[PDB]
Amino acid sequence: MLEAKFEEASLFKRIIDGFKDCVQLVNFQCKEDGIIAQAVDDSRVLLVSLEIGVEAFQEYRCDHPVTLGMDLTSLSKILRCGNNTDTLTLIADNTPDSIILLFEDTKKDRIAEYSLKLMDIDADFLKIEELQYDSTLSLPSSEFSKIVRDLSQLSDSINIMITKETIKFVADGDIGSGSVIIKPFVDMEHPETSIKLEMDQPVDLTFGAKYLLDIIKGSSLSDRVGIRLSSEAPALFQFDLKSGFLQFFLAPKFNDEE
Amino acid sequence: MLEAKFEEASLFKRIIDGFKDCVQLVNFQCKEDGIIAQAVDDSRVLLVSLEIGVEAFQEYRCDHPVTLGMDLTSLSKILRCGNNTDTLTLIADNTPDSIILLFEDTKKDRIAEYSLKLMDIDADFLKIEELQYDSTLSLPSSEFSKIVRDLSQLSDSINIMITKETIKFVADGDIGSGSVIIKPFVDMEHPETSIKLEMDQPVDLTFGAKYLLDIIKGSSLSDRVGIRLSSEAPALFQFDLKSGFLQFFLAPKFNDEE
Amino acid sequence: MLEAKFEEASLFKRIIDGFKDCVQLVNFQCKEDGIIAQAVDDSRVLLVSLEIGVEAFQEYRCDHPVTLGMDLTSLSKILRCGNNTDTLTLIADNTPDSIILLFEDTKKDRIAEYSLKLMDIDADFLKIEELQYDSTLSLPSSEFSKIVRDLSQLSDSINIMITKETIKFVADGDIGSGSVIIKPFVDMEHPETSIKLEMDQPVDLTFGAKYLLDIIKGSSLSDRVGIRLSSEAPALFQFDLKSGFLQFFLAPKFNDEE
């Protein structure tokens, strides 16, 4: 069973836009403590992991863990109906064939009620995140977006190099090249702008501009993105929600991978 | 002869945008009491009927019913010059080859004067609207636009079902389906939001999302669209003007038609 | 050597957008009194001539005339990083292979430093502007833009006819035709709106709508464009800068040329 309704349909429409783009399907599933989901591009280098806590729903009941996959573009079309304030109510029975998305106006005039035929995925969820990542930084999300779009002009691969007290994005391509370089610092004038960074061992990872571009669409969800990198493992970029989060595990380039 | 000038060129540029899109040509023609026009798509299921009363012109003289057809996209290009406030003056002689559209600034500096070569249509105007339509409703135009765009995401055909005190748009397609359902109601707090509906006999008509999408572009002309449906006849959607109107007669789907 | 930094990176990003579009390459070069540049489309009828005085830089040193060519689209990509306020510093050594464009935030956090591989052009600068042009006019730039976009709807060639106290743009095409006509006049209420025009001999020149469309993108640089026409010579359209300018020499149509 499943019955969950958000206050503002925007929140759910915001989140889904965050990965609607980098993955073809998403296998959603509700647990007693909230909703979670996961997706992997066909290119098999990008993993999307989502969690919306109960804390984010005005009503929520998942009395029996219903797993349900579905095409994202199809889900986005149904979410276009959005109304970003008028109540969105996910509804899905015990063993569903389609999830019913129900929007209702502030009164009872509009019964916008869509049903989206679910997909069929042979659920193989992955737990690849790890305990210790070589380096860990965070920074204003939009600062990060700029850097990622910018450098992706020059090259198809952005290189993220982290050394002691120095974070350096560098794109080197054909027309030329360029590199943004930032340093950790505080700002109690609005601490959520200060660049936090710990580095257990300096790291140098190169990723695909393509994918990174997708990963920054989660910026419309948080004030600060957090990036953790590991030499022997996909880097974990994350954006926090009011209860829950949205994380993208991107596999660093071998020479391919991106 | 013909000499008609609107106060704000916007009004005429607004109207023409309303059907510029769903028809290839329009056969314009002036009568002593105003200007009227009609168009039918090549697909032969959509009829556009327009009427701009004298009441809407600052000057108007049609001393001898000049019928003049013309391509819409071509007319739209000439209307792009629009200036939405600066005086547009339609001018066309007794037996014209082209209509002269003249814009002049608030003084005499700008003589924007275009001439558009008329087309040649063997005028066969149609009077297909009828006395009694099975059901009749009206509603905020934008409410209607939403419903039409929305449902057209799911399907290529929107179905409009009208029963006692229940108006229900339903699109059922491949990714899934969905239906908006509204009920008649008043609102003296701004009566032009209240949903008026009379139903002599309940009706169930299915149309083409494609066409309906075009029909809602007339929303930029009125606060409320009016829809009248008939079992044995094209549905009449209309948008009222300050003297005159703009109506689209769309032929309900057999299985084809849209 | 070369080291020049603008206060607001916008100014340089504004200028380059002005011709980024109508030319493939630009051969930049610094002289003791400022920076200048020139470009010619492959179509060989449009010349772009630029000059940014020292007066427009917060710092400037060109101790040895370094000529450097470069692709514009590539330059525009690097200028997208723009930040329109944060300091852009052009840097190029004595005999460069690439120009380094350096943006820095208001503090020292962001070292956006790009390098653009220069091109290789066998510099043949042209001095084709002349002493006396048959007619000379100026007018609000945006007034001019309108006229140029408008008429380019009807035709592929705009004709500029200048007679005593009458400036008349006329496009005559297939769907029809149209002509804007203006007259010289003063306005001490904001003199920079008054249409200045001297005519030593009346002129009638026809140009390519295509090119003229490009020439008006320099409007985002000045309040008034200035057009000087000559029977036996490319017309000179210009936009003035705070020290310097931007001029486009367009070759009038023979029947071809545009």
Side-chain angles (χ1 to χ4, degrees), chain A residues 27 29 62 80 90 109 128 164 166 185 213 224 235:
Chain A
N27 194 105
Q29 125 153 21
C62 172
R80 291 179 201 218
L90 294 188
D109 185 31
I128 79 193
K164 187 194 62 180
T166 302
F185 72 86
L213 298 180
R224 306 171 60 65

Short mmCIF file of all heavy atoms in Angstrom, two decimals, chain A residues 27 29 62 80 90 109 128 164 166 185 213 224 235:
data_model
loop_
_atom_site.label_atom_id
_atom_site.label_comp_id
_atom_site.label_asym_id
_atom_site.label_seq_id
_atom_site.Cartn_x
_atom_site.Cartn_y
_atom_site.Cartn_z
N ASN A 27 13.72 3.17 -9.80
CA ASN A 27 12.98 2.14 -9.10
C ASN A 27 12.68 2.73 -7.73
O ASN A 27 13.59 2.81 -6.88
CB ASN A 27 13.82 0.87 -8.99
CG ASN A 27 13.00 -0.33 -8.57
OD1 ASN A 27 12.69 -1.20 -9.39
ND2 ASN A 27 12.62 -0.37 -7.30
N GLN A 29 10.51 3.06 -4.07
CA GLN A 29 10.08 2.05 -3.10
C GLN A 29 9.88 2.70 -1.76
O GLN A 29 10.72 3.48 -1.32
CB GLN A 29 11.12 0.94 -3.02
CG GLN A 29 11.67 0.65 -1.62
CD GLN A 29 12.15 -0.79 -1.47
OE1 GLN A 29 12.45 -1.49 -2.46
NE2 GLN A 29 12.19 -1.26 -0.21
N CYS A 62 2.80 3.68 4.36
CA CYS A 62 3.39 2.64 3.53
C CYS A 62 3.37 1.36 4.34
O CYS A 62 4.41 0.77 4.60
CB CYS A 62 4.82 3.04 3.23
SG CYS A 62 5.75 1.80 2.40
N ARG A 80 4.30 17.72 -14.75
CA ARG A 80 4.22 19.06 -15.33
C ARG A 80 2.94 19.68 -14.81
O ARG A 80 2.90 20.87 -14.49
CB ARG A 80 4.21 19.04 -16.86
CG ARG A 80 5.53 18.61 -17.48
CD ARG A 80 5.46 18.59 -19.00
NE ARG A 80 6.50 17.72 -19.57
CZ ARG A 80 7.17 17.98 -20.69
NH1 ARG A 80 6.93 19.09 -21.38
NH2 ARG A 80 8.09 17.13 -21.12
N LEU A 90 0.71 10.93 -3.78
CA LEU A 90 1.09 9.69 -4.40
C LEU A 90 0.22 8.59 -3.78
O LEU A 90 0.03 8.55 -2.57
CB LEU A 90 2.53 9.38 -4.09
CG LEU A 90 3.60 10.29 -4.64
CD1 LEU A 90 4.99 9.65 -4.36
CD2 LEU A 90 3.36 10.39 -6.14
N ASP A 109 -12.81 21.84 -6.42
CA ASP A 109 -13.13 22.04 -7.84
C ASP A 109 -12.30 21.22 -8.84
O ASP A 109 -12.84 20.70 -9.81
CB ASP A 109 -13.07 23.54 -8.22
CG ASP A 109 -13.53 23.81 -9.66
OD1 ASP A 109 -14.40 23.06 -10.16
OD2 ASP A 109 -13.03 24.78 -10.28
N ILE A 128 27.01 1.22 -2.71
CA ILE A 128 28.42 1.42 -3.05
C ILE A 128 29.09 2.57 -2.26
O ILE A 128 30.31 2.74 -2.30
CB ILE A 128 28.63 1.65 -4.58
CG1 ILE A 128 28.30 3.07 -4.95
CG2 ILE A 128 27.70 0.80 -5.38
CD1 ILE A 128 28.18 3.27 -6.38
N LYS A 164 46.45 19.96 -0.12
CA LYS A 164 46.29 20.65 1.16
C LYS A 164 45.82 22.08 1.00
O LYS A 164 46.47 22.90 0.36
CB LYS A 164 47.58 20.61 1.98
CG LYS A 164 47.44 21.16 3.41
CD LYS A 164 48.81 21.43 4.06
CE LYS A 164 49.62 22.50 3.30
NZ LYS A 164 50.94 22.76 3.93
N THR A 166 43.74 23.44 -0.93
CA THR A 166 43.58 23.92 -2.31
C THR A 166 42.68 23.00 -3.10
O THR A 166 43.00 21.83 -3.30
CB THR A 166 44.94 23.97 -3.06
OG1 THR A 166 45.84 24.82 -2.35
CG2 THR A 166 44.77 24.50 -4.48
N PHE A 185 37.64 28.50 3.51
CA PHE A 185 37.49 29.72 4.29
C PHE A 185 36.14 29.80 4.95
O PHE A 185 35.15 29.24 4.47
CB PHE A 185 37.70 30.96 3.43
CG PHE A 185 36.59 31.24 2.47
CD1 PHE A 185 35.47 31.97 2.87
CD2 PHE A 185 36.70 30.85 1.15
CE1 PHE A 185 34.48 32.31 1.96
CE2 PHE A 185 35.71 31.19 0.23
CZ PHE A 185 34.59 31.93 0.64
N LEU A 213 27.55 18.03 -15.64
CA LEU A 213 26.51 18.98 -15.99
C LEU A 213 25.17 18.50 -15.45
O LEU A 213 24.43 19.30 -14.88
CB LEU A 213 26.44 19.17 -17.50
CG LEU A 213 27.79 19.74 -17.94
CD1 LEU A 213 27.81 19.95 -19.42
CD2 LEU A 213 28.08 21.04 -17.18
N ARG A 224 24.09 24.18 -0.67
CA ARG A 224 25.46 23.76 -0.73
C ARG A 224 25.51 22.33 -1.21
O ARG A 224 24.71 21.51 -0.76
CB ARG A 224 26.05 23.80 0.67
CG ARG A 224 25.91 25.12 1.34
CD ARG A 224 26.33 25.02 2.79
NE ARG A 224 27.72 24.59 2.92
CZ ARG A 224 28.75 25.31 2.50
NH1 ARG A 224 28.54 26.50 1.94
NH2 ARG A 224 29.97 24.80 2.58
N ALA A 235 32.91 9.06 -7.06
CA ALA A 235 32.83 10.24 -6.19
C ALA A 235 31.38 10.42 -5.84
O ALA A 235 30.51 10.20 -6.67
CB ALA A 235 33.33 11.47 -6.91
#
